Design a binder for these strands. Structure first.
Lengths: 200, 81, 102, 96, 94, 200, 94, 108, 81, 96, 200, 200
DNA sequence: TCACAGGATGTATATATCTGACACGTGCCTGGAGACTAGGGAGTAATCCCCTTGGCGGTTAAAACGCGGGGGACAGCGCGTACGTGCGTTTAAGCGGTGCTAGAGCTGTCTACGACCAATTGAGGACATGCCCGGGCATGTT
DNA sequence: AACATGCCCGGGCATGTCCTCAATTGGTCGTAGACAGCTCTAGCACCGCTTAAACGCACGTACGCGCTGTCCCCCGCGTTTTAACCGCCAAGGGGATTACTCCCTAGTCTCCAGGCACGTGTCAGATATATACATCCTGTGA
């Protein structure tokens, strides 16, 4: 279905200097998740671990939370709610925490919360923010994407943007970033192709 | 056919000497160059054909030329090999 | 696999080639590992100098000309490749001082 | 009118042709010269375009390399102009 | 159908480690394949003669280490030996 | 049927500096939507997305609305109501929000309202206004046109003007603009043809 | 005793068939040995590369007859080719 | 048991066909070596050996010697234009050089 | 050991050049010859020693010198090979 | 007294030293130069007499062959005398 | 809508040797009706006179009637009822005898009847048979076709067969023939194009 | 789900000599429907017309019916019920006669019936049998296939056999035939590819 | 400058001693040949696709030819330094043992390494399958 | 007849899965290397005597370098002609791939000769030493 509103995508580092970072994965076969700085785009396989780093210039207060939400990149599709396709929505792959229909999950965190928003009908996943562990400059959240971009009745070959928001205990904005996401069978092949086309 | 050594033309010989940094070229250079180039071609082609005959082929490939060049103390990159 | 030595160059292709080519009957398994490290190191030296040569010419892409210049701007590689001809390599812009106008 | 006092163009050609990469010999006539020579060793030979490309690059590199050494012999004789005897020397020093 | 052996994958990979933003033309890739096959034939041919001369039965990292020191100029030899030594050292531990 | 009146087509920017904008699409033969500044004209396919930008110098009050309406450009036909042709009126293509007979729809937006004016018989579609994000200069509304200009018994090759009006929550006129619309199978071919006729 | 193979014998039989009233100094002999080994390594090496290039396993009279033409000047090549042909022709006939 | 006849004798050669078959078939040159290959190569080596010894024996008689010394091998190899290519980079112990004096150095 | 490059005497440099057909000399030749000789001899010693270390010997043999020369295009006859 | 004209001994010496075969460097001076060089790469290195003779004959052959090419470079410059420039030119032409 | 059955289309000359004929009209651009024996096909303009000759070997009994009906030539469409498109159905072009939705009319004959069959939902037009006049071997009926073959929501570019039946007082079958019909704006151009494609 | 049984595919011409036939369509890349005798296989687009001819040696009794059913061709999958995938099951494309989940539909016929078998869980579509027109030799039924063979969560690229059964008024088996089916976007390209791979 | 005489060096001839090579003999140690069997390689034939060779037309570049002036090359002449030749003195090398140690070369014994073979999973490219836009035809108005 | 305007299939690209090949993993068997020990050769160091070579100095001529003059040759520019280069098409040949069959080479085992090593003597050869004759180089005379 459609949504009553469009989430804001604008980059906003805020009082804490909020930014995103990603791992230096290669472009080989069977690679689970790989990111392109040139395209600001993540390429990954269905349901596999997708690490996203949170970077800040100063530490946010306790009770801060981190939220991920997907929107279609093209302006006319922006009001449609990004969700799983009917096949993957029916298949028995829930982890006991995530609802069947959500595109984005967080793995490894028991404080995860999944919101089907009452007013906007948007799906989003939320976890508490935590400062980096000793010896680290950043905090890593492991996401999973639960449908290929090509899934008919789901994303239907349309590109999506993942929006990451840092927010307080009431959900008020503290910082925001976004990246494009392609969920596909060969993340290495597709990343190489899109990076090679950038020189054509 | 015949008379293709005349196809190694005078200004082309000039250009090759321009790469060699040659500022002025004397008129006797062009025939001396043709004779020298002909010797070089004869030695390369003869060895290349000998490789092609050995394989019983009728077609000289880049590899045949590359090997013919290699043994004359001159290795050529970019054509296979 | 290549990830065991941390090398990008494929050790077993080198191992198979050393088993053929009639170089020897037999091989110690450290041999292709060692040789792969050398061919990769030498490959890095050429490609690093060539990428700098492309940047000097303001191109985003390496072409054979940029290999030719990069090889000759390091006298070690110039000695290693002293009898090698490069396809579309061109030559160095060297002009002897006695030729310039004075 | 205006015309060049000689040689400034020659130094510009040296700069231009040292900077460029492409064949300086003609694309087709050399291929006929290869055929004219090759038929002496065997008739009905057939020629891959890549093989002829290899011969051209080898011949240019040889001739250009020869012209470098010829240039140095001429400078050694303190001449501006290269001469057949410069070519004969460099070749003979090189064991040809 | 037919398939071919080359180093283009690894040349492309090494290029990304020295200049991540830079591409390579197919002609330059061809030069790189000749360079690898040449240096290989020289080291393999030289290591073969060291084994023949000492009448030993096998090519080792020793024969390769010596052929490298015989083929390369002194500065390139130092770094090449260091990388081959690390590779064997790590491979032995792995 | 014929209307009792003709709506005003006169441009009026008003207190908020209201203007329209359009995308820089090319003239590939079958491009879905393309606009000509020289003709002040949109060329588009039936039922395809037609993005129209809304520009303002300051943000209008909450409860502001945007309305679209169509009239024939030729004075001989201005009194006729622009509507879908009898075929497309009968076909079952309603999106659950739009009546069968309306020429113009807005896609994606759940808060849309459709009016068949009891006093003038004119069809129109209305949505609430929404502001852009603080670094973006305009808001995009995605219209759909539900008949070709060439449809017999409907527009019947007669050109139409789309009139866009900004309104308050009571319908008072805050601003107005207009542009010509051709709904056709090959918008790039047709745009090139009409721009070439501008040199003949 | 430990044995090393040398060609001094056959060098000092070939001379007796060419100039029966002459002999060879130990140093001239040593030269004729290094000449034989050199030419042998050259022909064997080129015959090896011909088999390698052609992706084929067996060295035959052909690979040698081709290596000879490649290594020797044309006048020497024709005579060596003649002798090599006659030796194999007789050996297979006997 | 048949009484042994060497392959050298069968081919009419003096050079040792068995040694050459060993030097080919083992010591890292080949995957396989066919029986005609050693015979062909022994003849070739024998031919070039005979050419060098023929020329060197003549140089020895030109010096009124009966024993071939390294000088005579050098003279044979440099006087013959073809041997001077085949062995054009070889260095020979106590070879000496040819009596080549350039004409511009001569008195006048 | 030091300064044995002076052991290459001026008359020895004369005799080597006389063999090479050289008739008349400039005194600069002696110092230039010693530099060129040192470079050639050092390059051969370095290869020879390298073979010696490979064989894990203390003593350089003629065969090591032979292989050190040979690879530079200098096949040496008369010392084994 | 008698006295030769300056420059005429050479033609006898050229013939003598071209005709004779003995080594032209003395044994001990060359032997110590080999050891003096080699110690820079490894101390306590040791030597076969055959090896030292092998090194010497390669060095005399190299210098003699260099001196012949040097002589031709001088003749080409129409000089009677060889100079470092002739050495440098010949070596450069050979790619050394 | 769909019919419960399909009318028969088999040629049947019967006891009276029934068959059809057509005028030798040309292929000029202004021609209103023209026929192709090579294609067994009539090409005609909308609402214009379309002469069809009836030929017999002997004269049928008094009370014999002639019926015309249209069916789609392609078998999957045969159960759909051929009718005018929604535009031409709503327009005011009735002659006072023909219903608004019927595709085929007969002009110049006050004895005409139009049937919308209660059992099959098929439209057909019927007239009495009359024997040939002085100087003719055949009786000519003037039909009019009231939609182009291309009309959307009507024939929609699908070819049709006109079925002609000779029938008795109860409607029992005395004879039958059929021909393909194309109703188009330029019959001469189209006939020439289809006859030229008969050699390609 | 999985069925309790596998329908018999074995050809049985029966007392009436029942057999199948198909049209001589071309091999154009995107042709709507085409059939291969060499493969006994139909290639067709989703929802497009698929003509199947029925041939008999004598005419069956009145009340005879014709049924179509689908099974997977590979023995491993024969026990699964062939049905539409979850996406196409949810789409609003029913014609008012067919259930949402059935793979096979019949177009054109108003007397069609659809069965979900209570014992085997299989799906099938049924129509009354009708004899040929006089002078014709076969009866044509027009099927539509409502998912591509490639649909995930449904056929999932697994080939299917369509089984056709001739039946009495009660469903008793009078005759049986079968053919393989591929539902795909470009039937001509695919058909040629499979026919060329028959020589390899 | 050309011819003859004197001085110095080279070449030719003769005699004596020592070493090297050659020849012969004896013994020793594998190496080669001879014979038989097993598996792979190479050779031959058929089929398929790609590349090369050959042909045709158009447009521009390159090559060829001509004319005028400047620069370079070549030749000649003059002056100074460097090199050559000869003589005398000093230093090192060469030659010939004398003495001792390290390494080289070879043999023996045991362990590890490498090769060879089988089964299971990932790398890499090719193939399987669907949507867009473009091309071009189909169909109407002026 | 020319332009107005909608609709379907094709080229190409987009994107998910399969097949073939190498790696990984493990085991078994034989050979080579490594390690250790022993024996002899060669290398290194040292000392004395004799000769040659090298080093330094003195004296004279030849060569090198620089400068100047004259003529020829090449470059530069313009115009004209010829072929090259580019683009596309057609046909055949050659090369590549796959399958099948026979011969050749390799491997294994056993026996005799060939080759190698060592020793001895003679002859020849070469080297060393001495004498005589011829050629080459330099100076003197016209």
């Amino acid at each position: 279905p459609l949504s009553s509103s469009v989430p804001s995508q604008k980059t906003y580092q805020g009082s804490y200097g909020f930014r995103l970072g990603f791992l230096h994965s290669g472009t080989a076969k069977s690679v689970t998740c790989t990111y392109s700085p040139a395209l600001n785009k993540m390429f990954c396989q269905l349901a596999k671990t997708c690490p996203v780093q949170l970077w800040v210039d100063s530490t946010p207060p306790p009770g801060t939370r981190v939220r991920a939400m997907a929107i279609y990149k093209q302006s006319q599709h922006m009001t449609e709610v990004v969700r799983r396709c009917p096949h993957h929505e029916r298949c028995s792959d829930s982890d006991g925490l995530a609802p069947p229909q959500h595109l984005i999950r967080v793995e490894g965190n028991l404080r995860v919360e999944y919101l089907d928003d009452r007013n906007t009908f948007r799906h989003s996943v939320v976890v508490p923010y935590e400062p980096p562990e000793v010896g680290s400059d950043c905090t890593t959240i492991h996401y999973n994407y639960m449908c290929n971009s090509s899934c008919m009745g789901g994303m239907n070959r349309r590109p999506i943007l993942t929006i990451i928001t840092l927010e307080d205990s009431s959900g008020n904005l503290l910082g925001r970033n976004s990246f494009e996401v392609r969920v596909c069978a060969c993340p290495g092949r597709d990343r190489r192709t899109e990076e090679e086309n950038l020189r054509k | 056919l015949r008379d293709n050594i005349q196809g190694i033309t005078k200004p082309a010989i000039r250009r090759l000497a321009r790469r060699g940094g040659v500022k002025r070229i004397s008129g006797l250079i062009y025939e001396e160059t043709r004779g020298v180039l002909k010797v070089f071609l004869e030695n390369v082609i003869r060895d290349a054909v000998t490789y092609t005959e050995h394989a019983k082929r009728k077609t000289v490939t880049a590899m045949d030329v590359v090997y013919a060049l290699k043994r004359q103390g001159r290795t050529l990159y970019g054509f296979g090999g | 696999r290549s990830s065991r030595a941390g090398l990008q160059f494929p050790v077993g292709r080198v191992h198979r080639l050393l088993r053929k080519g009639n170089y020897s009957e037999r091989v110690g398994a450290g041999a292709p590992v060692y040789l792969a490290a050398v061919l990769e190191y030498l490959t890095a030296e050429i490609l690093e100098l060539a990428g700098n040569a492309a940047r000097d010419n303001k191109k985003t892409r390496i072409i054979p000309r940029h290999l030719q210049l990069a090889i000759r701007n390091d006298e070690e590689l110039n000695k290693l490749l002293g009898r090698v001809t490069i396809a579309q390599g061109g030559v160095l812009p060297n002009i002897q001082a006695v030729l310039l106008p004075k | 009118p205006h015309r060049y006092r000689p040689g400034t163009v020659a130094l510009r050609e040296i700069r231009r042709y040292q900077k460029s990469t492409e064949l300086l010999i003609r694309k087709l006539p050399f291929q006929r010269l290869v055929r004219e020579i090759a038929q002496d060793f065997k008739t009905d030979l057939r020629f891959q375009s890549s093989a002829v490309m290899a011969l051209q690059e080898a011949c240019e590199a040889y001739l250009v390399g020869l012209f470098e050494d010829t240039n140095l012999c001429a400078i050694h004789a303190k001449r501006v102009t290269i001469m057949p005897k410069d070519i004969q020397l460099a070749r003979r020093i090189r064991g040809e | 159908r037919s398939r071919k052996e080359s180093y283009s994958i690894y040349v492309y990979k090494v290029l990304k480690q020295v200049h991540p933003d830079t591409g390579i033309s197919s002609k330059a890739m061809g030069i790189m394949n000749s360079f690898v096959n040449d240096i290989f034939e020289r080291i393999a041919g030289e290591a073969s003669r060291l084994a023949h001369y000492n009448k030993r039965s096998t090519i080792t990292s020793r024969e390769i280490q010596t052929a490298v020191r015989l083929l390369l100029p002194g500065e390139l030899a130092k770094h090449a030996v260091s990388e081959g030594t690390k590779a064997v050292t790590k491979y032995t531990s792995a």
